[PDB]
Design a protein around this ligand. Structure first.
Ligand SMILES: [Cl-]
Ligand SMILES: [Cl-]
Lengths: 594, 594
């Protein structure tokens, strides 16, 4: 279990917080001489770099956009003098992909994983009342011992080029907000809630972790601040009579309030009373079935790359609502915590995905996810280091996101090898670990490439429901062969039906690249009309199987990828353009999903 | 030698001609029951179809655009009564890809090859003074015994889908003009001219073929109609003193006049006195070196497909002149005869290409032309039938085009297998046959894919000069690897240099797909800026080798291809858009080629 708290920062009497967002100093370190040359003390010749954002798309030259290797940030903040006697942490929403944090010259901690928060305890070096310095050494290379997976090519000048095993640009930097926070010396470290429904009434079971021994009181407030339940102890049950349940696209948020007393700490968070259970082939939310309708997405916008902005969230949610979606998948990595906060208010359902993408050794991975070629990926001697990373990223993800009502499943892989017992052994461990970290035991899943065929795949028995990525009519029998493609699709769904697994299937990826404004009569692959015809055919197949309980189309919006001959300025399978405007097919979803 | 004349039709006393262009009747024959059901007599339920044009892009539904198999045309013309006693032929500029011609109910002839004229002698069935009927059964399937090569997929309904081994849409139909012509019973069938330069003076050596025994007189007129030479005999030498030579981008056309006498026939054609010789690594035109600057092209325009229109020629030549080009390659098939006629007036140099494309078994042939995978193509038992077709298409091409001054080389293959003695044996025969059909023995060549490596290729010793297709910085080390690509290019050109072959090299294909209006700073593959950077780098490499004597960039204009995931509405490697407007890179050529 973890040496820090994953809880979002708040500001009350006992807990303080100050934003470090703004313009930082930035400098590339291509010869990797920073540590030995005093950069922990300040950067020798930096530039200005916005935070949060991704560094790549600001520059005007290739070597800098495509930089791969070591690079540094530095900034300076004044701590209020009133934060003596408090524990003081730096909280980075993310450090992509790995980094060591230095503060006032001292190395505080290093982290691996570029999509989950990083906590640095600077209590012993922070100078309250004075100006303080923070310096972060970051690395954005890809390998097969960390997620997401890939490789690093050295070119003739010795400069490094990222060669990912995934299909999305390797944005990196400090992409999410950065805080400095003050906690009490005895503090709430973690807590977990589970829900039971008793007719109209409800139980909120909870457990609490603290950095101390003092008694804990837990209060639960309704939307208007009035009290509805109170229990003493670090373990308890809250009784909410005539409970107001969090519903799909109709949220109700209670407020939990955790206290440590003699009052030493207070933590407050919005939660939603709802239950998630798989009965047979159905997904039950509050004991009634739900059908998932929505999109795979990316944290991706012009200029900012993966940088968080609230304006992107607002628009992306006003578009999801306009299509009448109810659900999205945080593909292929946990998002910024603000996305889940807002999903909670709006009643969207989230499949939360750990970044286990790239577990097949292929640099053009999307044509290759149906080629039939096994890459011997889980037979290699780096696999134990990889497994340790994957489990640690699952643990940090679940701890961070488990108390959001919108999060209803965990996706623990996208398009890996599953056709050999080497991969069963691997994934069995991962699921085992995820089952222990989630106090609610909500459904665990992953998304399968076409190569994980019903006859050969070893891993679908680990899944509570099964997610399929399928491109019938695009990478398989596309264009004039599109009727062959429908058959082949039905052929496979027939074989899955024949297995009588009695579990739900969700299509988590299907789509066509579509250039906005390419019209052709008759339609051709890449036009707007072909996208509509494609979707109308996948819909017919989905609607032919009682156990298909969900469609998450790929993608919500055009996004940026590694450049290559099959990628025309990124990936054009969006239903919206990258500036968040709808292609002709968005209307297809809107109508179907009403 | 051939049972018909390849000479363009003219109209004088002795030779008459009438156009059949207009709206014809058209009908698909998917069950292939036309012959047995009386369609030779008239079509049972036809539609209207323009001639010349390609049928595919008129329709609004897939099954008809993508039709593959048998299909029929029919029209009706009145012959003047005055054409009794004349021999009467139908002349189709083309019938793509194969066809049997019926006239007034009788089968006249069938043809194989879809890019060269088809002559049908209807003398014995034509009814002068009445209305006559012509009916053509056509087939547009692809195989490995005819050119260009491919395959035919049967889908689940039994309908056929063309699966070409080449990268261009399988347009088909009656794509060029169609005449009915009247000849004298004793007529000029063929003639050939060769040129010698004697200081300021010149010799036009000629031979003539007739369908008879009567004496032949040959006259040569200058631009203004005045006489400059006369010789009796079917074999002769014309002495032109103070000759006016056809020059690059500065043409002079004399007029040859062939007569049969007692006067029984007259044939007239414009020719240009010029010489083509390869001395060492130089291409000499009129004994001085020339550097080829221009484009590979296609017969390709919106709506019309491969249909000929003079307006396309005019605009395409006003664009070539604007880029300061001097040369193009009729890739990948002989064009309509009007293109060469106009090249003669404008002084452009032409590499004339027989349609020997597809001689490697691959349906995504352009990523595969550098993959390294041999397809065992010339070891197969269809190869002798294929060779017979290729030689017959070379023979018909050369006979048709040999007397154009603009035609200065023959390309006899594009991107075939060359790395085994199976293919040497094949191509040795082809060159042997082409050498016999060309009275001027002008240079013979072909274009090589990257897979025909210097160490392995068996076929470059047959070539008078060597043509290379290379995509360094696009299908090989493109994008951020573009400096690796330059090296690799130089590595190969170094190996060719080391072979000290002392022959000229012409790059006949290099380019990048470029979406008009995609700008990015820094540039990415597919943008307009990347095209410029690509070209500026290939130019540096070309300019580093004394023996590179030509650059023909691919392509002059965006054109239509089989639809697929790597083709965004056709092929975007044009320097012009398909509507004949310039991308940013066209200006690069303009400046370099002044
Ligand atoms: Cl640059
Ligand atoms: Cl249709």
């Amino acid at each position: 279990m973890l040496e820090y708290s994953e809880l979002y920062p708040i500001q009350n009497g006992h807990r303080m917080m100050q934003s470090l967002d703004g313009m930082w100093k930035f400098q590339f370190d291509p010869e990797e001489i920073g540590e030995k040359s005093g950069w922990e003390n300040g950067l020798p010749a930096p530039v200005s770099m916005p935070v949060p954002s991704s560094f790549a798309d600001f520059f005007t030259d290739h070597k800098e956009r495509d930089y791969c290797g070591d690079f540094w940030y530095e900034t300076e903040f004044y701590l209020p003098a009133e934060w003596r006697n408090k524990k003081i942490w730096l909280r980075f929403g993310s450090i992509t992909h790995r980094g060591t944090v230095y503060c006032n010259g001292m190395e505080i901690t290093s982290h691996e994983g570029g999509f989950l928060p990083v906590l640095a305890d600077i209590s012993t070096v922070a100078k309250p009342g004075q100006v303080n310095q923070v310096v972060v050494k970051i690395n954005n290379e890809l390998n097969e011992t960390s997620l997401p997976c890939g490789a690093t090519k050295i070119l003739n000048n010795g400069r490094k080029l990222a060669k990912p095993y995934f299909d999305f640009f390797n944005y990196s930097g400090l992409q999410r907000s950065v805080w400095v926070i003050a906690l009490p010396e005895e503090s709430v470290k973690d807590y977990s809630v589970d829900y039971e429904l008793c007719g109209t009434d409800a139980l909120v079971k909870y457990e609490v972790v603290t950095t101390g021994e003092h008694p804990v009181i837990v209060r639960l407030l309704d939307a208007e601040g009035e009290l509805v339940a109170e229990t003493e102890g670090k373990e308890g049950i809250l009784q909410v009579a005539n409970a107001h349940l969090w519903e799909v696209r109709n949220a109700y948020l209670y407020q939990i309030v955790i206290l440590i007393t003699d009052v030493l700490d207070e933590y407050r968070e919005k939660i939603g009373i709802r239950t998630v259970r798989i009965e047979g082939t159905q997904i039950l939310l509050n004991d009634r079935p739900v059908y998932l309708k929505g999109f795979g997405k990316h944290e991706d916008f012009s200029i900012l790359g993966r940088g968080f902005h609230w304006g992107i969230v607002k628009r992306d949610f006003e578009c999801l609502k306009w299509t009448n979606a109810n659900c999205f998948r945080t593909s292929h990595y946990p998002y910024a915590e603000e996305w889940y906060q807002f999903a909670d208010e709006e009643g969207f359902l989230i499949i939360d995905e750990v970044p286990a993408v790239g577990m097949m050794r292929s640099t053009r991975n999307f044509v290759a996810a149906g080629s039939g070629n096994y890459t011997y990926f889980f037979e290699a001697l780096t696999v134990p280091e990889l497994l340790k990373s994957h489990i640690a990223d699952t643990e940090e993800m679940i701890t961070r996101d488990k108390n959001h009502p919108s999060v209803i499943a965990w996706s623990l892989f996208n398009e890996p090898e599953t056709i050999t017992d080497y991969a069963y052994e691997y994934f069995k461990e991962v699921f085992a670990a995820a089952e222990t970290y989630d106090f609610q035991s909500r459904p665990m899943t992953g998304a399968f490439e076409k190569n994980s065929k019903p006859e050969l795949c070893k891993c679908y028995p680990l899944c509570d429901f099964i997610c399929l990525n399928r491109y019938y009519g695009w990478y398989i029998s596309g264009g004039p062969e599109i009727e062959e493609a429908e058959e082949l699709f039905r052929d496979e769904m027939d074989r899955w039906k024949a297995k009588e697994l009695n579990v739900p299937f969700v299509f988590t990826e299907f789509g066509t690249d579509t250039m906005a404004g390419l019209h052709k009569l008759p339609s051709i692959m890449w036009s707007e009309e072909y996208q509509k015809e494609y979707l109308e055919m996948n819909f017919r197949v989905f609607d032919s199987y009682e156990f298909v309980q969900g469609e998450l189309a790929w993608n919500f919006a055009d996004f940026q990828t590694t450049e290559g001959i099959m990628r025309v300025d990124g990936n054009h399978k969006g239903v919206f353009t990258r500036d968040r405007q709808p292609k002709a097919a968005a209307v297809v979803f809107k109508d179907r999903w009403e």
